[PDB]
Each structure stands twice: as C-alpha cells, then as structure tokens.
Amino acid sequence: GQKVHPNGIRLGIVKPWNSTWFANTKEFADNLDSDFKVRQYLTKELAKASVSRIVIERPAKSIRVTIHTARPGIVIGKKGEDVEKLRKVVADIAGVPAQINIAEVRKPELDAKLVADSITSQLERRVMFRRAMKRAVQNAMRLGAKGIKVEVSGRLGGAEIARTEWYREGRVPLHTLRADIDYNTSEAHTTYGVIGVKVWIFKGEILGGM
C-alpha cells in the first residue's frame, strides 16, 4: 500500500523544520511564496555544488539562509565572491536585507539527498542502474550507516515496460518514530522519460526530544 513520508511523520519527534519563522495569517502565505522562490533560485544555480538542505529563517524584518553543502569551497569562492553575489540577489527577491551561511556536510555518502542525486546523475549518463544502486549501499554502510535502502523505478534500462527495484541492507525501521531515518528523492530525466529515485538512511535511534 501507500507509505507515510518518513520525514513528515517525525517532524516534532526527532527532526527539525527547514523553515523556522513565526507569522500571522496576513503574511504567512507570503513568506511561503518568498521562501519557495529563494530555494527555486539557489538550487537552480548551485546545481553543481552538492547541496543537501536549504534551511531558512526570518528573524525580524530580515532573512538568514543557511545552506548545507559537501563542497563549501565551490559555494564560497575567492574569499567569498560568489556568496556575496547570492546574498545580493536573494535580498532582491526576499524583499528584505539578506545574509547567507555555509554549513559543512562531512560525510556526503551518508546524506539521503546527496546520494539520491548521485544516482540520478549516473542514470542520466546511461549508467547501469544496478551498478549505481549497488554502489551506494556499499558506500553508506562502509561509513557507518546502521542501515540503508534505495528504490529506483520507471523505465529501467529504457525498457518498454516500467518496474520498481530496491536493495536494502542493515536496519531501516520506518514504524519506529524515534528512529532517525534520513529520507529524500530525486527525479532523473532519461530519454525514455522520468526515472524516480528514493533513498532511506538509518543512523540509529535517539533518546531525547531535544
């Protein structure tokens, strides 16, 4: 059957939100459309910077945006030429003074969103889908994933009929709520149409709401 979004279900329990501001109804819909746009822009033009998450706060007639990456060098630039550019052209669309930070993703192989795209890229380069899938589960467990699952689906190897294949190894307990499982997806655009990718990474169970 259908399955609940493993991020969504764990939102209060063990995960954070990506956008964290407060607003009254009057400006609530407006902060959403504003945020959307900044993400729509950043992800577009940081495509090749390996970006995992864009967490985005509105402190007090302002906006600080703190954007996780496993290639910070490429985002920063030559003592921060690109970063200030981004800043300039965010405040453009945020409609307020903006500032930007750069969080560091140490283990890019243990990041659901990063690995997800890793595959989606390979698939775009006519790489064998089993190789991509198989490689990821190795890397992950090698670096101390307590478990890992990757599903891929669509017209695999350009087949006239669509199917859905998945490997797991380790524990991936989706019913346990305190279980920190990192989940994310990426559509790939082959010439046969869309191949969807989904990834689950278990990091272990937590003992404190925090």
Binding site: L11, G12, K15, N18, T20, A29, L32, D35
Partner: protein
C-alpha cells in the same frame, strides 16, 4: 493551469486595485437613501461603464505555484496538493500531522 489563465488573474488584480476608490465612492452614493435622485441615477450609469475586470468579485484564488482553481487554502496560498507536498518536507513552520 494554462499560462493564459494564470495571466488573467494579474490583469484582474491590477485593475481591481487601481479603480478601487472610484468604485467605492461611486457605489457610496448609490446606497445613499438621502441623496439626489439626479446624482444616484447618474452613478448607476457611471459604475457600469468602468471595466468589469476591475471588480474584486471577478477574481479567483489560484494556488500561487501550480495555478489550480480548486481546493485552495488561504493560510498558505497553496492548493491542498502543494500544501501536503511542502508540509512533509517541513517547509511550513509549525505544521505537522495531528491526532486527538
């Protein structure tokens, strides 16, 4: 939604809040019982003249992401679909699944 349909909503907003005052005061005399029959009768002809798409009742809330005309929510300005999609990422502060 067809690009065209998204567009009309912009043409319609823009007018609505340019002739906004003209309409209001031009209406205000209509509903004034204690006013000149000469005045009010003129008004009725004058309101119907300035353009239809300049009325606030003429516009339709469409998701400000996909353009959908149905299943809109005011708090978010999104369709039920896009609300759910964003909810689950945690792009809507506070929002989360509920039980009681």
């Amino acid at each position: 939604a067809k690009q065209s349909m998204k567009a009309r909503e912009v043409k319609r907003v823009a007018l609505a809040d340019k002739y906004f005052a003209k309409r209001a005061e031009l209406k205000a005399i209509i509903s004034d019982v204690n006013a000149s029959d000469e005045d009010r009768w003129n008004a009725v002809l004058k309101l119907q003249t300035l353009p239809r798409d300049s009325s606030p009742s003429r516009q339709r809330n469409r998701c400000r992401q996909t353009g959908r005309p149905h299943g809109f929510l005011r708090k978010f300005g999104l369709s039920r679909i896009k609300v759910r999609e964003a909810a689950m990422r945690g792009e809507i502060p506070g929002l989360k699944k509920a039980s009681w």
